[PDB]
Amino acid sequence: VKVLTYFGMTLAAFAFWQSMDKVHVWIALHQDEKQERMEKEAEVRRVRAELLRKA
């Protein structure tokens, strides 16, 4: 490829990596919601088992 094509590709990849950084920050920001959802679903399963174990 031409030198300028290579450099334009490198600039595109730099933009892609900065977007990846934004994605990682977003995923980090939603840890608490995910743990809360996990806890609620675990409680659902445990209540269902304890009610089914009763019979």
Binding site: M20, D21, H24, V25
Partner: protein, 100 residues
Amino acid sequence: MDLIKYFTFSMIIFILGIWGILLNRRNILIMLMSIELMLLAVNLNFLVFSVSLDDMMGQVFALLVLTVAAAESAIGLAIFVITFRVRGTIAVEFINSIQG
């Protein structure tokens, strides 16, 4: 966020190796080179993990893997050379006689 970025560097190298396998049906030399890319990505993971965990076991394996990569490249290029010599070409239509 350091560790995730090092890991995604290794990740893109591994993914590029997979893609080189997928995209080079007619170019078995680049298939070999893609496999070498995958091996470099794993070697980097061991070094990055060794730094991250403060443990030297990652580095010992990194050196030994470099030895394995060297030997495997040597023998692979030997097999390439003999295949080329027998056929006079590297085209994949001449290495498909065994089938079924």
